[PDB]
Design a protein around this ligand. Sequence first.
Ligand SMILES: [Mg+2]
Ligand SMILES: [Mg+2]
Lengths: 437, 437
Amino acid sequence: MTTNVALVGLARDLAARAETGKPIRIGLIGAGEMGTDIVTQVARMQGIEVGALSARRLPNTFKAIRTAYGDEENAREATTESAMTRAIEAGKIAVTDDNDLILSNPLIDVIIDATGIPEVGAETGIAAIRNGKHLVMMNVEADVTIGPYLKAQADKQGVIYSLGAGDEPSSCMELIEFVSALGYEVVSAGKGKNNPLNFDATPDDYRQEADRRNMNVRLLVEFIDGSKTMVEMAAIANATGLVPDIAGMHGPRASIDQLSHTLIPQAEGGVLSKSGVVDYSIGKGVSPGVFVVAKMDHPRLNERLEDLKIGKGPYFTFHRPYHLTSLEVPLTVARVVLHGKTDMVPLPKPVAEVCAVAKKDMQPGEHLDAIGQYCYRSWIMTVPEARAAKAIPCGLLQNGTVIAPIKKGELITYANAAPQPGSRIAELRALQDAMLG
Amino acid sequence: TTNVALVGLARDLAARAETGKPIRIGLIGAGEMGTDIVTQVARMQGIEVGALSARRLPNTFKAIRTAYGDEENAREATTESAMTRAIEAGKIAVTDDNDLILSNPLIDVIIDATGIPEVGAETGIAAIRNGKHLVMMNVEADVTIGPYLKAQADKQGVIYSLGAGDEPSSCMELIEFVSALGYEVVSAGKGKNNPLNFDATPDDYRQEADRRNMNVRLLVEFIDGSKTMVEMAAIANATGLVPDIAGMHGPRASIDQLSHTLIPQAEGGVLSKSGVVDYSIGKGVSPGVFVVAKMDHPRLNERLEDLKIGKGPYFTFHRPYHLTSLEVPLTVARVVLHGKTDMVPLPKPVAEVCAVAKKDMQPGEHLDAIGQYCYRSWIMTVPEARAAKAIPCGLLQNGTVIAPIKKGELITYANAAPQPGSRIAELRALQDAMLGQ
Ligand SMILES: [Mg+2]
Ligand SMILES: [Mg+2]
């Protein structure tokens, strides 16, 4: 009709949900780019709606709705529960500047924080779970810091925790599930980037592109300096047991057609010390999307994949050549609510830690700024290596205090820096560490 | 073996293994596809081949020896009590009598891997009659009598599905995704590296078939387009997409050109309308399958452009692999564990696989078989096939020519008569009666 095709699978399940007259209802925190994308995407779908939308400043909620629909007719201001419930019952998106109204409204099935602020994702995440709501996490920086604790609390409450679909970590998990259900060895998994990283990048280098693209300069810097890649790969590690092969990963030069001879063991001509890793490639054809390199262990299976022109064995590349970011998150919401399935959760025992390296020399008393700025960049390590070094989890570091001189390129540790101790995020991480100890 | 924690369907299969009662497949046909399935299941958890049949008993032992290295796991059974005792002993029961498999109480799901459409029809209705789920690999049979099989499965309370891993069922994965997200499916299908040759015969391929120890008919039906017509018809008949013209356009297009080619003429492509099955000639599409989708909101167009998915409003979604028989056990797992089909025909077919003569023939000659000398498949809409009195291609093997036929001419009830006594002609008449109601 709009789609040109009969209803099948999840599309059919959503249509059946719509026919009940009670759609799945998202409580959406954050009316910026990702939130506006979600509102826009849900408007094309059946059986799923945004019940309520919050922003720090109320006008930005109306702006998001106007961008999605071309006018504000679907928006209705609500600053108490009775007003929010009435709005939703009237078929409106309740808009508010009070997150707690969304977190506690009885008609909201699932919470998504789209602010892009890890501390807010932590705060609203534990609130969602305490209110007995399912939680879909888009903030990967938060997830790699406190995900295991959120997941444990979600299980204590009988709700589902999941990373949202459409970002490299969760998209890669689709490939991992497929290869592993078939009983094949996962040799390496990850993402690519078209151009080399620049670990020295700062907002001075990108402020011009940011202005031109009307976007947050920090998103550019964390892209170029490797930080986002380190985070995303750690999320895959911590959901699978795959490990970085070396701190920071290898990040070799490899096009899509070269992965199966590069991100494999050194004994077989690759760069890896062992099989079972997260890594990434620099080169053409991989981004957007994600990959798994799998090994065949039976000569007949090798021959079938060679006859099918999948590669030359025993290593083969499985590529998902797209990820739609925000746009796929409603699919996670549907799977959670209709099927009781998560798309991606951390394991109970993390295997990797996102650590941080200084981008510049700093003296005691200076404050560390923020990811995507001037002072530091993320750096993946195994948990044992991070612990030996007393590395501070990168997610804790914004506005931290330097307590001993730090040189450009040096690891940020509990010997040379101190997080702001009063954050929900440092306080939740302490609880996670106690749970794990 | 996999290097990763159990997630999703893998986890579901491991939990099934822990019950001590695996999913049990009854496998009919010990040739190449059936040997692939025995080999693939051997590296999976929670799923086993309970029994294997062949026309000639020694081929069952040969399949098992190719899978395992020796024939140890095989045990001949000639009665139900022997078969059940063999399965309970951890053996693969082997026989030359399909009915022993079809009626054994320990068998959960039947798969016919013989590659013979008539046998797929016969064993499929028998599997349903016996209250077993049915996974169909024979697409030639499915596009002939699939609707009837699906209706009879519904009456018995069992599940009918095409097996995963072939172009039609792989494409349905993409169609599900795009349509769940509410996007317009413009075109869907597969690719071929080189131009079709409609005049190909076994003489052109017998040398390569001998060299590769393979059936020459598989090569001829690939080259002459027959398999492509069948696979696109299966997608059509599961979705309501239609060939835009008899035989489809089959334009030259690489993977990067699909989104400007298999789109409407008004927008610079070749199609008369949106919502089709078609195929491309050129690089980078094969192996696997595509959907070209259209965006209907400028923000969603912008997002996909920013992600470098394409230049809008048309975008290509590619699954760059499909593993043939190796994925079929995933269909078995989803059917038995989750009650989900991977692919079913709609109740009302929209496309018919018809046939065209490859050479002049005179009355009294017999038509031979697909992949040989006399005829090739040719997709048509159902209304055009009806109007022309076209015979469904699946009925034609060993049919009688009853009026002169020229090279390139459609095979119709006016110029040929199918063998009337086949299970496939009989079941097709039943389907036509059911559709008349
Ligand atoms: Mg990402
Ligand atoms: Mg095929």
